[PDB]
Design an enzyme around this catalytic site. Structure first.
Site, PDB file in Angstrom:
ATOM      1  N   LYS A  75     -17.862 -21.252  39.324  1.00 59.66           N
ATOM      2  CA  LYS A  75     -16.801 -20.325  38.964  1.00 59.66           C
ATOM      3  C   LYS A  75     -17.065 -19.590  37.656  1.00 59.66           C
ATOM      4  CE  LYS A  75     -12.571 -21.404  37.577  1.00 59.66           C
ATOM      5  NZ  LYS A  75     -11.176 -21.944  37.578  1.00 59.66           N
ATOM      6  N   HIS A 126     -18.107 -14.620  37.237  1.00 57.06           N
ATOM      7  CA  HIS A 126     -17.371 -13.484  36.679  1.00 57.06           C
ATOM      8  C   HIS A 126     -18.176 -12.865  35.548  1.00 57.06           C
ATOM      9  CE1 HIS A 126     -14.327 -15.891  38.824  1.00 57.06           C
ATOM     10  NE2 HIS A 126     -13.909 -14.685  39.180  1.00 57.06           N
ATOM     11  N   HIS A 140     -15.531 -11.810  46.110  1.00 53.71           N
ATOM     12  CA  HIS A 140     -15.292 -13.208  46.482  1.00 53.71           C
ATOM     13  C   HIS A 140     -13.815 -13.405  46.785  1.00 53.71           C
ATOM     14  CE1 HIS A 140     -14.806 -12.996  42.094  1.00 53.71           C
ATOM     15  NE2 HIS A 140     -13.917 -13.962  42.225  1.00 53.71           N
ATOM     16  N   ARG A 154      -2.152 -15.013  30.115  1.00 53.49           N
ATOM     17  CA  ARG A 154      -3.379 -15.784  30.244  1.00 53.49           C
ATOM     18  C   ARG A 154      -3.910 -16.251  28.899  1.00 53.49           C
ATOM     19  NH1 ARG A 154      -5.924 -15.131  35.023  1.00 53.49           N
ATOM     20  NH2 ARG A 154      -8.082 -15.068  34.162  1.00 53.49           N
ATOM     21  N   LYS A 180      -9.647 -17.472  28.667  1.00 50.96           N
ATOM     22  CA  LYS A 180     -10.028 -17.081  30.022  1.00 50.96           C
ATOM     23  C   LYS A 180     -11.161 -16.074  29.983  1.00 50.96           C
ATOM     24  CE  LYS A 180      -8.431 -18.443  33.267  1.00 50.96           C
ATOM     25  NZ  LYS A 180      -8.876 -19.680  33.990  1.00 50.96           N
ATOM     26  N   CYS A 213      -2.756 -17.413  39.563  1.00 49.08           N
ATOM     27  CA  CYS A 213      -3.800 -16.877  40.436  1.00 49.08           C
ATOM     28  C   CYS A 213      -5.002 -17.823  40.380  1.00 49.08           C
ATOM     29  CB  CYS A 213      -4.253 -15.466  40.098  1.00 49.08           C
ATOM     30  SG  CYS A 213      -2.908 -14.341  39.650  1.00 49.08           S
ATOM     31  N   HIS A 243      -8.763 -19.326  42.883  1.00 46.39           N
ATOM     32  CA  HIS A 243      -9.912 -19.158  43.750  1.00 46.39           C
ATOM     33  C   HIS A 243      -9.963 -20.299  44.764  1.00 46.39           C
ATOM     34  CE1 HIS A 243     -11.322 -16.770  40.166  1.00 46.39           C
ATOM     35  NE2 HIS A 243     -11.789 -15.994  41.139  1.00 46.39           N
ATOM     36  N   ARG A 261      -3.430 -24.882  42.033  1.00 44.82           N
ATOM     37  CA  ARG A 261      -3.452 -24.224  40.718  1.00 44.82           C
ATOM     38  C   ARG A 261      -2.074 -24.265  40.064  1.00 44.82           C
ATOM     39  NH1 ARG A 261      -8.118 -24.429  38.260  1.00 44.82           N
ATOM     40  NH2 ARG A 261      -7.510 -22.721  36.840  1.00 44.82           N
ATOM     41  N   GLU A 276      -2.479 -25.437  36.348  1.00 44.64           N
ATOM     42  CA  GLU A 276      -2.146 -24.537  35.245  1.00 44.64           C
ATOM     43  C   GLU A 276      -0.750 -24.767  34.680  1.00 44.64           C
ATOM     44  OE1 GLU A 276      -2.897 -20.453  36.388  1.00 44.64           O
ATOM     45  OE2 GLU A 276      -4.744 -20.945  37.415  1.00 44.64           O
ATOM     46  N   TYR A 324      -9.063  -5.872  45.667  1.00 42.65           N
ATOM     47  CA  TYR A 324      -9.146  -4.964  44.507  1.00 42.65           C
ATOM     48  C   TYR A 324     -10.370  -5.243  43.653  1.00 42.65           C
ATOM     49  CZ  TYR A 324      -7.186  -2.371  40.507  1.00 42.65           C
ATOM     50  OH  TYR A 324      -6.962  -1.505  39.455  1.00 42.65           O
ATOM     51  N   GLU A 333     -13.326  -8.298  37.905  1.00 44.25           N
ATOM     52  CA  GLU A 333     -12.932  -9.122  39.054  1.00 44.25           C
ATOM     53  C   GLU A 333     -13.051  -8.218  40.284  1.00 44.25           C
ATOM     54  OE1 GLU A 333     -11.394 -13.332  38.965  1.00 44.25           O
ATOM     55  OE2 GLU A 333     -12.666 -11.959  40.156  1.00 44.25           O
ATOM     56  N   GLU A 362     -12.250  -8.864  44.314  1.00 51.18           N
ATOM     57  CA  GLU A 362     -11.668  -9.908  45.131  1.00 51.18           C
ATOM     58  C   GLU A 362     -10.932  -9.425  46.367  1.00 51.18           C
ATOM     59  OE1 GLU A 362      -9.315 -11.792  42.056  1.00 51.18           O
ATOM     60  OE2 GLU A 362     -10.911 -13.248  41.626  1.00 51.18           O
ATOM     61  N   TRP A 367      -3.996  -6.191  38.372  1.00 48.65           N
ATOM     62  CA  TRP A 367      -3.724  -6.814  39.675  1.00 48.65           C
ATOM     63  C   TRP A 367      -2.240  -7.059  39.897  1.00 48.65           C
ATOM     64  CZ3 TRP A 367      -8.187  -8.251  42.665  1.00 48.65           C
ATOM     65  CH2 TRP A 367      -9.396  -7.982  42.016  1.00 48.65           C
TER      66      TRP A 367
END
Ligand SMILES: C[C@@](O)(CBr)CCOP(=O)(O)OP(=O)(O)O
Ligand SMILES: C[C@@](O)(CBr)CCOP(=O)(O)OP(=O)(O)O
Ligand SMILES: [Mg+2]
Ligand SMILES: [Mg+2]
Ligand SMILES: [Mn+2]
Ligand SMILES: [Mn+2]
EC number: 5.3.3.2
Lengths: 180, 176
Positions: free
Chosen positions: B18, B22, B29, B48, B52, B64, B66, B80, B84, B101, B111, B113, B158
């Site tokens: 992971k 990025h 992905h 965030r 990050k 959000c 993965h 998550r 989180e 996006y 990103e 995705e 996003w």
């Protein structure tokens, strides 16, 4: 670089190194804040870089800083506009001279300031300084004020406090006129 | 943890660790996005953490992430949410399944995705993981939409793209 320390009333008593001055126990000192408009009347909003000690990564008004010994507040505005944004401006207008505020940032750093507020026009292109500013937008003042009203928590507290002062807000409004 | 690499069609073709995935050149992905509301119908908006790799310090929707190989989107959301935000949720409901996006953050991290969007209700209090979330706000969805509409730049791109999709905004507006 330093800050100008002030006591109970607004009177200078000495200076203090700037990094060392901004801690969990920051003493009262002199600052400025400025709101910058392009010729078209759009407002420059900026995002503080992630390396700033206080409110890193936070969306706010155009430029703020700390006048130095021997400096007038207006020269400090002109210098920081050059330093942070590389931009030339018209003579800064005083729009909220008695603004004073204390606030704690998300990691515990405190700003405790006497912070007169200015507005000016930009007269050159920007050359953003990425050590100071990580993002920016040219926006309609109306839009910015609607966002501050809907989600004030998304912006720096000082930006919001200055924007909702009636008198400062009327001056911001006057800077939205197009000027050639 | 990894991300799942997708071909032009959304077919999984492999994985990447992971963090290493990025970059300024992020490859397509799989991901998810979710909007969480409490029993009162308030929306949880989060900021965030500054650590990050993508969009650090940015205000965005609730959680959000993965999905891992073989993991359902729904289970990823629940995972998550726990990781989180320390929070239990109701079964995630689909609100924008074909969202896709690509964007670049202020430091040049991309990103890229396929990112189905969900919504759910919290069933327990939050317990914040400060490695993921540095600040948060419970708010009325109406106010958040007004903010996104007026100053979209103040929020993650996003979050904006999701909230501006007609149907999604429709379906979100019913969790209150
Ligand atoms: C942040 C504030 O408006 C309150 C006063 C200080 O502004 P800065 O944090 O930008 O200060 P400098 O680092 O000198 O630019
Ligand atoms: C960026 C995205 O919403 C699309 C999916 C990724 O969300 P995160 O960036 O929060 O992912 P994680 O670090 O795994 O939590
Ligand atoms: Mg500054
Ligand atoms: Mg996440
Ligand atoms: Mn200061
Ligand atoms: Mn990703």
């Amino acid at each position: 670089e330093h800050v100008i320390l002030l006591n109970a009333q607004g009177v200078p008593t000495g200076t203090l190194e700037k990094y060392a001055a901004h801690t969990a126990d920051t003493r009262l000192h002199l600052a400025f804040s400025s709101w910058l408009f392009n010729a078209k009347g759009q407002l420059l909003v900026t995002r503080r870089a992630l390396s700033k000690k206080a409110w890193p990564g936070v969306w706010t008004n155009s430029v703020c800083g700390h006048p130095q010994l021997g400096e007038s507040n207006e020269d400090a505005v002109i210098r920081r506009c050059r330093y942070e944004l590389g931009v030339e401006i018209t003579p800064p207008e005083s729009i909220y001279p008695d603004f004073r505020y204390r606030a704690t940032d998300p990691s515990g750093i405190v700003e405790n300031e006497v912070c007169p507020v200015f507005a000016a026009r930009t007269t050159s292109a920007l050359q953003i300084n990425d050590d100071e500013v990580m993002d920016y937008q040219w926006c309609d003042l109306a839009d910015v004020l609607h966002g501050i009203d809907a989600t004030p928590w998304a912006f720096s507290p000082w930006m919001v406090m200055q924007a909702t002062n009636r008198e400062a807000r009327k001056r911001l409004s006057a800077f939205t006129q197009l000027k050639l």
